[PDB]
Every structure is written in C-alpha cells, then in structure tokens.
Amino acid sequence: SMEFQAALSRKVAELVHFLLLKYRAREPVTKAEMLGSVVGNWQYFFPVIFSKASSSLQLVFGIELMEVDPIGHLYIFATCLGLSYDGLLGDNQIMPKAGLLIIVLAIIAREGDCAPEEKIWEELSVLEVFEGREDSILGDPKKLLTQHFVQENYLEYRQVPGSDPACYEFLWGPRALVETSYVKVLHHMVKISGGPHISYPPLHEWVLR
Amino acid sequence: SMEFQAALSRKVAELVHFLLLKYRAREPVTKAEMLGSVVGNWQYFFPVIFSKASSSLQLVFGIELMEVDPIGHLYIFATCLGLSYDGLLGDNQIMPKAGLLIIVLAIIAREGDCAPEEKIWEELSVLEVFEGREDSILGDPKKLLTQHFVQENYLEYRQVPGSDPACYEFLWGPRALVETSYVKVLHHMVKISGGPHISYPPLHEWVLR
C-alpha cells in the first residue's frame, strides 16, 4: 500500500511532466492523449492521477489547465491569475516560477501592506523545492529567487522606515497591482487548496458532562 | 497525554460555557475574569484554552468575541457576520444557532445559486451536534432545524423546477441577502478555519527520478 501509493505518486509525476512539455510547446492536449501517456493497468486510476496532476500544476507551477472543448476534451494552458510571467528561459529545463511568485504575493497579502523579509524566509524555507541548499556559495536559492520577482517588478524591497540597524521588508510591486489583487490571490490559494479545511472541534471541547 | 489532551479539552468546554453565560446576559467580560474562571495549574495553559474557546464560539455557535478595550482587556460579543439572529428563546438553555445557519448558507454558496436538499442533508449529517438522532419521531432534527432558517427568512425552500417526481432545493432567502453576501460568508469560513490549509504535494509526485 505504501509501496502502492508511492508507485501511484510516480505516475502522477510522469503525467505532470508530460503536461509540462505540452505547456512549454504551447500545444493543446486532449484527455485521450493524457490517458494514452499512462501505461497499462494504471489507466484504471487516471481520474485521481489527472486531478492530482492538475492540482500540482496549479499549486507548484502556477499553471492552469483549462478545457476549451467539453466534447472532444481538448485542454489548453494558462498562467494562474493571468500573470504575464512564468520565469522560463528558452527551452532550458528550469522550473516554471509563477506558482512560487503567487505564494510570495500571498504571504505578503496575509500580513497586510508589507511583510518583514524574515517572514518570507520563514515561510519559504518550508517548501521542499529548495531541497536544503541554503548554504550555496552563490547565495541562498530562495533569496535569489525573490530577486527575480523584484526585478520583474512583481515585488518591491525596501528598508523598514526608521529601522536601526537596517531591517527590510517586501511589498507588492507595480506589476502585481496591475495584473491581480489581494482578494484574487488569497481566493486563489483557497481554491487550489481544495476549499477551506474546517477542523470542527470534538464534542467534549464544547459540551459539558 | 491522550488523558492530558482530554483534560485540556474539558477546560476549553468550561471556558466556552463560562463565556456563553456572559453572552446570554449581554455582560462584557475581561481577560482577567476568564483567567479567573480557570482553576489552578491550568492557568499556565490559558493562551491555548482561550484561543480554542474563542474559535469554538465562532465555528460552533456563530459568536464573535471582540476586544473593545486593548488596555484593560475588556471583551464584548457579537453574532458572526453581524446577523440579527441567534436562535435563542428567553433563558432556556438551548444552543445558539447562528453558527449552524452560516454553515448552511455556506453549503449553498459553494454550490451556486441553489443546492439540492440532499447535499444539505449530506453535509449536515456529518456534524456531531445532531448526535445520531435522525430517527426521532418528531422528525430528523437537522431537517427541523433548517425549517427555523426558512421561517426566519434566511433560507427559501422550493421544488426544483420541472422535477417529476418532485425534488427540492434550498436557496438564500431575502434576509440572508440583506444582512450578508456570498463572498462574505465564504471568506468567513476561511477565516474561522485558520486560513487555507495547503497540503503541498511531496517531491516524488512532481519530480522525476
């Protein structure tokens, strides 16, 4: 079962990267093509493989998979929230970055008008994408990543006013305010997490014996 | 530990009902009064007892606990979303109903303009508040409860147009549309669930070996 779940997980990863190649090539893709990429008895599990792969694209890569033909089941791709950026570079196999960008925007959005950089590092250091390589000579990968977002004008970075010694904070840049909004981003994070997950308290926490 | 968690849970229930009595009496309450109601070594755990009790009031009872004096730590109460209804009856010790009302409104809101009654029963039958007494002679308690919400004009109940044999659906009534909105309700459910809970997929689900 644990061995089965892992094997199932592997089939998800394969569909994700099948779809990523289509995304890069800007090729529309049918459900029949996706099902065709899944081999053998695993086709029986295509519904969960598809929905898991589809969720991965949104959450991890910031990529939306949209059906434009409900009869022939033809899908196209779009960047989440309609952003004009995915952080790619030619055909180099580097990771699409819009999902990570949206996560940073969201962290800031929950904190108000701006967030101390320490909160950003704290929240980002949890993501397994950085695979514990913060001791890189070139510099902490997660910090160099946020520099992309600043230089693309999705983020601004400044000294906290009146701070001594200097502290620094992130805020939304002009490009983020144009292409989306606070509400849209926080709504998006809810949507792609599978709605709100309400842990209802047990009876003995609100009923007296 | 399991025995400790349960004992801790019991202290939460006691604070909840301490606060409920204040709520019924429309008495403001200080943090010092709350801490005073907690006995002995359990005072060391007041922060988690408070936050758990505070969340219970919102989620279960539809009651907001609001600090109006940040210096003396004086709190008052309000109905969640500002609704003019809590479903109480004099000093009879029956459960405040606004939390259950908001949950029903939310179920409908997620489904669009209306929801089949079967979806309502399905979602409601999960709540432990009904303690498996759906076989009551008087009628299924959860169904009789929604009748309160209809008669108070928070909900409307009608036959699904063109259904044969007749099927039925719930929708927001005039009173719900006046006092709140779809957006506000779904936002509220997120807020009181402790933000969106994002289960990020494991590396082997989106990285190839």
Swiss-Prot record, chains A, B:
Q: In which tissues does this protein get expressed?
A: Expressed in many tumors of several types, such as melanoma, head and neck squamous cell carcinoma, lung carcinoma and breast carcinoma, but not in normal tissues except for testes and placenta. Never expressed in kidney tumors, Leukemias and lymphomas.
The taxonomy runs: Eukaryota, Metazoa, Chordata, Craniata, Vertebrata
One GO term in the molecular function aspect is: caspase binding
User: Would you say which domain of life the source belongs to?
Assistant: Eukaryota
Q: Single GO cellular component annotation?
A: nucleus
Share the record's PTM remark. Ubiquitinated by the DCX(DCAF12) complex specifically recognizes the diglutamate (Glu-Glu) at the C-terminus, leading to its degradation.
Source organism (scientific name): Homo sapiens
**Subunit structure comment from the entry:** Interacts with TRIM28.
Could you list this entry's UniProt keywords, alphabetically sorted.
Tumor antigen, Ubl conjugation, Ubl conjugation pathway
Q: Name one GO biological process term.
A: negative regulation of protein processing
Key word Ubl conjugation present in the record? Answer: yes
* UniProt protein name: Melanoma-associated antigen 3
Annotated membrane-spanning segments are none
What task does this protein carry out? Activator of ubiquitin ligase activity of RING-type zinc finger-containing E3 ubiquitin-protein ligases that acts as a repressor of autophagy. May enhance ubiquitin ligase activity of TRIM28 and stimulate p53/TP53 ubiquitination by TRIM28. Proposed to act through recruitment and/or stabilization of the Ubl-conjugating enzyme (E2) at the E3:substrate complex. May play a role in embryonal development and tumor transformation or aspects of tumor progression. In vitro promotes cell viability in melanoma cell lines. Antigen recognized on a melanoma by autologous cytolytic T-lymphocytes.
Where the record annotates domain MAGE, the positions are: 8-207
